[PDB]
Amino acid sequence: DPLSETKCTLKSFTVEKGIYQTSNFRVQPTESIVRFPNITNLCPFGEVFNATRFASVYAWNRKRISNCVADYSVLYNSASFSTFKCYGVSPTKLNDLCFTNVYADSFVIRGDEVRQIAPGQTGNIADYNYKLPDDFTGCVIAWNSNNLDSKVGGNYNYLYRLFRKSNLKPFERDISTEIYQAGSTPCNGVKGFNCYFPLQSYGFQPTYGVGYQPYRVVVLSFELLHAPATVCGPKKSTNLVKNKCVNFNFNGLTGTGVLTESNKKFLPFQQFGRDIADTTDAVRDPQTLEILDITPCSFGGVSVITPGTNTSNQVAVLYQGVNCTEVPVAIHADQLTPTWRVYSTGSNVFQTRAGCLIGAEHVNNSYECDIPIGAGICASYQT
Amino acid sequence: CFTNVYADSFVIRGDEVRQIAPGQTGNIADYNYKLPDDFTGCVIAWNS
Amino acid sequence: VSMTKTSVDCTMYICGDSTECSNLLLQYGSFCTQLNRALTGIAVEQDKN
Amino acid sequence: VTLADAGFIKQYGDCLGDIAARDLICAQKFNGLTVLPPLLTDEMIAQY
Amino acid sequence: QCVNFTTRTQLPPAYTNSFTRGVYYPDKVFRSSVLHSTQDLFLPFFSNVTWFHAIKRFANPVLPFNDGVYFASTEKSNIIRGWIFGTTLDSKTQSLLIVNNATNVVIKVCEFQFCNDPFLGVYYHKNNKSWMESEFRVYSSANNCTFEYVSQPFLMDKQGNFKNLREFVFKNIDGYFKIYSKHTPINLVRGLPQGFSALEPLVDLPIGINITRFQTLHRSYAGAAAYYVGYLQPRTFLLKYNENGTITDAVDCAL
Amino acid sequence: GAISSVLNDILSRLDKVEAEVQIDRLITGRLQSLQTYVTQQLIRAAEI
Amino acid sequence: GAISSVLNDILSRLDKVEAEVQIDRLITGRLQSLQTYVTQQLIRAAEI
Ligand SMILES: *[C@@H]1O[C@H](CO)[C@@H](O[C@@H]2O[C@H](CO)[C@@H](O)[C@H](O)[C@H]2NC(C)=O)[C@H](O)[C@H]1NC(C)=O
Ligand SMILES: *[C@@H]1O[C@H](CO)[C@@H](O[C@@H]2O[C@H](CO)[C@@H](O)[C@H](O)[C@H]2NC(C)=O)[C@H](O)[C@H]1NC(C)=O
Ligand SMILES: *[C@@H]1O[C@H](CO)[C@@H](O)[C@H](O)[C@H]1NC(C)=O
Ligand SMILES: *[C@@H]1O[C@H](CO)[C@@H](O)[C@H](O)[C@H]1NC(C)=O
Ligand SMILES: *[C@@H]1O[C@H](CO)[C@@H](O)[C@H](O)[C@H]1NC(C)=O
Ligand SMILES: *[C@@H]1O[C@H](CO)[C@@H](O)[C@H](O)[C@H]1NC(C)=O
Ligand SMILES: *[C@@H]1O[C@H](CO)[C@@H](O)[C@H](O)[C@H]1NC(C)=O
Ligand SMILES: *[C@@H]1O[C@H](CO)[C@@H](O)[C@H](O)[C@H]1NC(C)=O
Ligand SMILES: *[C@@H]1O[C@H](CO)[C@@H](O)[C@H](O)[C@H]1NC(C)=O
Ligand SMILES: *[C@@H]1O[C@H](CO)[C@@H](O)[C@H](O)[C@H]1NC(C)=O
Ligand SMILES: *[C@@H]1O[C@H](CO)[C@@H](O)[C@H](O)[C@H]1NC(C)=O
């Protein structure tokens, strides 16, 4: 009850005469909405992970995955992946999101060098032929392929780059093979002293050691919750409901609120609109392209008026900033954070400018102010 | 000195041993043997 | 003579409607009660003024 | 002196529209910042 | 087929100020009734833009692309139909070709060897009640190629009683090439139009290449048209979104 | 220094272990922002 | 709690992904040192 909440907030078994702030009330959600796009075809991860032949890391190959359903649990449960490390999501959560594009980058490197695929690293791979951006969002997936991919006298198709005038930019691809003039001399023609053909091959026989063996990398890359989505986890969508407090999820933008049809006019490329506080406050539904206002579920301050425990256990409750046409909706037809209802029974309800006071009778006599409420109103204990 | 001590004993594949860390997921961590996220203890494994 | 009374709900500002944020905010102890108490002190002082 | 709220009855349906987007009072309210009314109304100050 | 038709045809560079342009919607998020701050590659307000005008026989120079470009055309009959981007333009590196041909737009990045004058042409009104673009005289080899896309004609046309203006922004950042656009009719003789508008994002392309220098492509056959080049800079802008959520004014924070 | 400023983005994009490293930064920065505001307000209240 | 107080020393000896975690400590401690100075100065200004 509200008196027990004041005792708990004061950390005392006795409360003196006064008015005390307590936990803000808030209407809790009655059901869950999920709205992903109505897309049905599975994503072609087979073409990415069961490719017959991977690219050399100097010439890493990019595939673009779109308009499809991506069950990442299928990938992540496969013990085939020796490393599966994600940098702006957790692999558990991959099924609960939608992405604006997914680019899979495929290449071969030396197993000890997989360490350099992580974002912001340094060393010859991360410097000269495949660099992730510092803010990279995605998963680096790596596995040993020696038994499929190495050959008995060796495989030698797999060039890396040993030189470059400068570091490359993130997700740059350099196919130039023009001779690297390392010395002070100019160097036309295929070689020279202190002038090198800039690509050189890994040596991979199936006998060579773990860590020196050939590893296949896929890097999955994507961006989240600021743009219109096209790749999705296998989450089933549900009937969109309005004017009720609900747990929504649109394309992975989970939240709690009341949905309503807006007069906002989102440009075709927009999917979310935001308030002053960077919070999303409108959304375009991915299955019927109307723009919905999101409002937080109705809430407010609760303050408890007490004549004090030494006088009485009777208390009165101020729902501050609330018109009490709304507090009768906070009957147990839906749930609230404060579990006590009691005063919500009504009979002695009184709208003040400060919000609605429940459990105190309104009287036309004025008196000296005993417990102050606000906006001219006070309360007191009497016969 | 420890208030109660329990040793939990089992065999798994060597690549699944990573799943015995707290807060993990995968077939052993999911439907077999789950540690709590506030686990206090040691996980000890050797090739058999 | 006075200034606007403000009260700031520390949980709703810091952790707005998340329980698994509220369970971390509890690990900082009394600070939200100090903030509420300080702002309540200021608010009562405005009527006193 | 143009005020910026006085705590009076910002009854949530005002914060349910384009009105809510143009003003910062609804953003303050939705982020747990609430203005409260003075005990004496401007009537009572005028009477004193 | 490609023939080396004479010199660069004198020095055409004119100059003018960019009064109120080259601002664009900076991200895919809706906002309204807000003065919002954004830092990225923008065309500076009142910046000294280069200007080119067709006057017969024409040429388009090689232009730098440092930190990306603003490109615009004042036009009738779509005389400008695309661009080349790269760092060598002679198959020592990859390069990106964009064209709006008579069938459709094509986007392509290959080890291109361009001709010294990349150009296209039309035979005019030749009995079929049509204007056939019978000349694709742009490149001579494309050895290795790593991305290609094709779709349709990009022709947002009534009968040109006011002259067109097409506005583009090009960026090449963290391996993505980013294209923005806007179009309007305009009613000024030669000056760039004073008044506020902002570019929408149109396409994003996973090319992953060094672009140092850029160019623009003339479609050949009496076509009178002109185009403008500005250069973006890393700057901060303040944008006023109205209640409809359109950038209605801006302030360049370093003007 | 968190991956996003919006609390629900962290809680949708990360699991219970890696999320709490990010939520703690938002808690630290926001709690420092309130203690700043309440210090400004207590000092102001002494002038008023 | 950083490995050094010289900002360019940090930016030399560590590579970026953990150098930024060392810089985040100097940013936090120096910003706390300024919020301290400005609080003292505001309380002093009220005495003056
Ligand atoms: C509390 O809310 C109700 C609506 O839920 C308000 O009632 C309306 O008041 C206006 C102004 O007097 C009238 O034009 C409407 O006809 C009323 N509608 C209904 C259904 O009664 C009420 O005024 C609000 N109270 C306060 C103090 O704001
Ligand atoms: C057009 O003219 C240019 C010269 O202005 C020609 O370019 C030369 O081509 C030969 C091979 O035929 C090269 O050995 C020269 O080094 C080139 N010169 C330069 C400066 O690059 C070009 O071949 C001519 N093309 C046609 C089709 O006539
Ligand atoms: C590769 O092929 C096998 C057999 O068809 C299939 O079961 C497996 O799922 C494929 N790999 C991936 C990563 O899906
Ligand atoms: C791009 O090419 C130019 C000219 O060769 C060169 O100055 C620049 O360093 C190159 N940049 C990258 C990232 O390769
Ligand atoms: C998705 O399915 C619904 C019918 O269930 C349909 O009305 C809607 O048009 C579809 N979405 C799109 C983008 O067409
Ligand atoms: C309340 O306090 C008074 C002394 O101030 C005491 O006489 C009285 O018995 C107390 N009442 C109760 C119910 O404890
Ligand atoms: C107070 O007076 C009004 C008339 O001004 C009357 O309608 C109302 O019923 C009275 N209230 C009580 C509690 O008697
Ligand atoms: C800068 O603008 C003026 C016209 O205002 C122009 O004459 C001049 O050529 C431009 N600057 C350069 C370096 O061309
Ligand atoms: C436009 O370009 C593409 C790619 O070269 C080609 O298939 C198409 O036939 C071209 N159209 C014309 C009119 O040449
Ligand atoms: C008219 O079009 C046909 C193809 O349909 C072509 O063979 C013919 O040469 C064209 N006529 C002229 C005069 O260009
Ligand atoms: C906003 O859009 C409506 C409907 O198109 C229009 O009537 C109104 O004039 C627009 N606002 C402005 C400032 O023009």
DSSP category for residue C28: G
Q: Are strands A68-69 and A291-295 parallel, antiparallel or unpaired?
A: unpaired
C6 interface with F at CB cutoff 8 Å: yes
In a domain, E243, yes or no: yes
Backbone angles phi, psi at A124, to 5 degrees: -55, -35
Asked if B touches C (at least 3 Cβ pairs < 8 angstroms), the answer reads no
Nearest CA to ligand 7 atom 4: A364
Which amino acid is it at E11? L
Q: Which of F8, F9, F14 has its CB closest to that of A90?
A: F14
Residue E8 lies in a domain: no
Q: How many CA atoms within 13 Å lie on the side-chain side of D6?
A: 13
- Residue B3: Cβ within 10 Å count: 4
DSSP-assigned letters across all residues of A268-312? TT--EEE-TTS-EEEEE-SSS--EEEEEPPPEEEEEEEES-TTT-
Q: How far apart are CA E216 and CA E214, in angstroms?
A: 7
Residues touching ligand 11 (Cβ under 6 Å) are: E 242, 244
**In this complex, does chain G touch chain D, defined as having at least 3 beta-carbon pairs under 8 Å apart?**
no
Question: Taking CB atoms and an 8 Å cut-off, how many pairs form between chains A and E?
Answer: 72
Domain limits for position E156: 14-255
Residue E2 forms part of a structural domain: no
The Cα-based distances of D9 to A338, A359, A368, E52, F45 in angstroms read 22, 19, 25, 62, 25
Residue whose pair of structure tokens reads 């490149």 in the numeric block: E139
Give me the helix-helix angle, F16-47 and G16-47, nearest 10°: 20
Q: What does the alpha-carbon distance between residue E43 and residue E192 come to, in Å, rounded to a whole number?
A: 14
Measure the CA–CA gap between A346 and G34, rounded to whole angstroms: 53
What's the rounded Cα separation, in Å, for the pair E125 and E117? Answer: 25
- Contact residues on chain G for A121, CB-CB shorter than 8 A: 15, 17
CA A104 to CA A218: how far, in whole Å? 6
Tokens of A149: 């991919």
Q: In this complex, do E30 and A266 lie within 8 Å of one another by their Cβ atoms?
A: yes
Segment B36-39 long-range contacts (CB within 8 Å, at least 24 positions apart): B37/F16, B37/F17
CB distance A354 to D41 below 8 Å: no
Query: Alpha-carbon Rg of chain E, whole angstroms?
Result: 19
Cβ–Cβ under 8 Å, residues A301 and A21:
yes
Spatial contact of E93 and E86, defined as CB atoms under 8 Å apart: yes
Rg (CA), chain A: 32
Cβ(C26)–Cβ(F28) below 8 Å = no
Residue of A nearest to B27 (CA): A77
E9 found inside a domain = no
- Nearest chain A Cα distance for residue C24, angstroms: 17
How many CA atoms lie within 13 Å of A243's alpha carbon, on the beta-carbon side?
Answer: 2
Asked if A163 and A124 touch (Cβ cutoff 8 Å), the reply is: no
Beta strands A245-250; A253-261: pairing state: antiparallel
In chain F, which residues have their Cβ closer than 8 Å to the Cβ of B23?
A: 15-17
- Where do we find the tokens 């919020």? G35
Number of domains within chain E: 1
Return the partners of chain A (3 or more C-beta pairs < 8 Å): B, C, D, E, F, G
> What is the C-alpha to C-alpha distance for residues E46 and F40, in angstroms, rounded to an integer?
41
For residue A124, the surrounding DSSP H or E stretch is helix A124-128
Beta strands in chain E (DSSP E): 14-17, 29-30, 34-42, 48-53, 63-64, 69-75, 80-86, 95-100, 105-110, 113-121, 135-141, 145-150, 163-173, 176-186, 200-205, 213-220, 226-231, 233-241, 247-252
Comparing CA positions, the residue from E99, E70, E67, E72 lying closest to residue E83 is E99
Partner-chain contact C17 A296, CB within 8 Å: yes
Q: Which residue has the tokens 């799943």?
A: B19
Ligand with minimal distance to A312 CA? 6
> In angstroms, rounded to a whole number, what is the distance separating the alpha carbons of residues E155 and E187?
20
Q: Phi/psi at E128 (nearest 5 deg)?
A: -75, 10
Pairing of strands E113-121, E213-220: parallel
Q: How far is A178 from chain G (nearest CA, A)?
A: 30
Q: What is the pairing mode between strands A68-69 and A231-232? A: parallel
Cα angle: A51, vertex A96, A288; to 5 degrees: 105
How far is it, in rounded angstroms, from Cα D27 to Cα C43? Answer: 21
Give the residue whose CA is nearest to atom 4 of ligand 11. Answer: E244
Q: What's the CA gap between F7 and F11, in Å, rounded?
A: 7
Q: If DSSP codes are grouped into helix, strand and coil, which group holds residue E66?
A: coil
Of the bound ligands, which one is closest to the alpha carbon of residue E131? 10
Which atom of ligand 2 has the smallest separation from the CA of E3? 27
**And the tokens for A266?**
């989102």
The three-state DSSP-derived secondary structure of F10-47 is HHHHCCHHHHHHHHHHHHHHHHHHHHHHHHHHHHHHHH
Look up residue A63 and give its two tokens.
């595939």
The C-alpha atoms of residue E120 and residue E182 are separated, in whole angstroms, by 24
DSSP lists the bridge partners of residue G43 as none
Q: Containing H/E element for G34?
A: helix G16-47
Cα gap G32→G9, rounded to integer Å: 22
**CATH number of the CATH domain containing E245:** 2.60.120.960
**Number of residues written out for chain G:** 48
Q: Please say whether the beta carbons of A42 and A68 come within 8 A.
A: yes
**Does any ligand 9 atom lie closer than 6 A to the CB of residue E103?**
yes
Q: Give the total residue count for chain B.
A: 48
A363 burial level (CB within 10 Å; 0-12, 13-18, 19+): exposed
Would you list which residues of chain A are within 8 Å, Cβ to Cβ, of chain E?
A: 61-62, 64, 101, 103, 133, 169-176, 178, 226-228, 264-267, 269-274, 276, 282
> How open is the CA angle G13-G16-G22, to the nearest 5 degrees?
70
CA angle (A138, A66, A221) in 5-degree steps: 15
* Burial class of D3 by CB neighbour count within 10 A (0 to 12, 13 to 18, 19+): exposed
- CA-to-CA distance for A87 and C32, rounded, in angstroms? 33
- Burial (Cβ within 10 Å: 0-12, 13-18, ≥19) of residue C14: buried
Tokens linked to A117: 């695929």
Q: Is residue E68 part of a domain?
A: yes
Chains B and D are in contact, defined as 3 or more C-beta pairs closer than 8 angstroms: no
Contact F47 G46 (CB under 8 A): yes
Per DSSP, the residues of A214-275 read: EEEEEEEEEEESSS---EE-SPPP-----SSEEEEEETTEEEEEEEEE------TT--EEE-
Helix (H, G, I), strand (E, B) or coil at G22: helix
Cα-Cα-Cα-Cα dihedral sign, residues E1, E4, E10, E14? positive
Alpha-carbon distance of A258 to A241, in angstroms, equals 9
**Residue A214, CB half-sphere, CA atoms under 13 Å: how many?**
29
Ligand 9 centroid vs E67 CA: distance in angstroms?
31
Distances (CA, A) of A219 to A46, A85, A130, A289: 15, 10, 11, 33
Tell me how far CA of residue C8 lies from CA of A261, A320, C44, in angstroms: 30, 13, 15
Check CB contact under 8 Å for B15 and A79: yes
Q: Which residues of E touch A172 (CB under 8 A)?
A: 175, 208-210
CB contact under 8 A, A354 and D11: no
What gap in Å lies between CA C22 and CA F30, rounded to an integer?
13
Contacts of A347 (CB under 8 A, 6+ apart): none
Report the C-alpha gap between E100 and E219 in whole angstroms.
10
What six digits make up the tokens of E3? 């023939």
Residues with CB under 6 A from ligand 3: A 45-46, 49-50, 75, 78
Does residue E3 form part of some domain? no
Neighbours of chain G (3+ CB pairs under 8 A): A, F
Cα of A93 vs its chain's centroid, Å: 9
**Gap between the terminal Cα atoms of chain C:** 6
Distance set, CA C47 to CA A376, E25, E96, F44 (Å): 11, 48, 71, 16
Of how many residues is chain A composed?
Answer: 383
Which residues are registered as beta bridge partners of A107?
A: A217
Q: Are A103 and E206 in contact, with CB atoms under 8 Å apart?
A: yes
A278 touches chain F (CB under 8 A): yes
Identify the residue whose C-alpha is closest to ligand 4 atom 5.
Answer: E87
In a domain, E138, yes or no: yes
C-alpha to C-alpha distance for A128 and A161, rounded to whole angstroms = 6
Rounded CA-CA distance A29/A211 in Å is: 52
Q: Which DSSP letter does residue E178 get?
A: E
Between strands A138-144 and A83-86, the pairing is antiparallel
Chains in contact with E, counting 3 or more C-beta pairs less than 8 Å apart as contact: A, D
Longest dimension (CA), chain E: 57
> Phi, psi (5° rounding) for residue C11?
-65, -40
| CB distance A146 to A214 below 8 Å | yes
Contact E122, E131 (CB under 8 A): yes
Q: Do A263 and A290 contact (CB within 8 A), yes or no? A: no
On whether the CB atoms of residues E44 and E231 are closer than 8 A, the answer is no
Contacts of F43 (CB under 8 A, 6+ apart): G39, G42, G43, G46
Measuring CA to CA, how many Å separate G26 from each of A106, G2, G3, G7, G12? 39, 7, 10, 8, 15
Q: Which two tokens stand for residue E180?
A: 């923005």
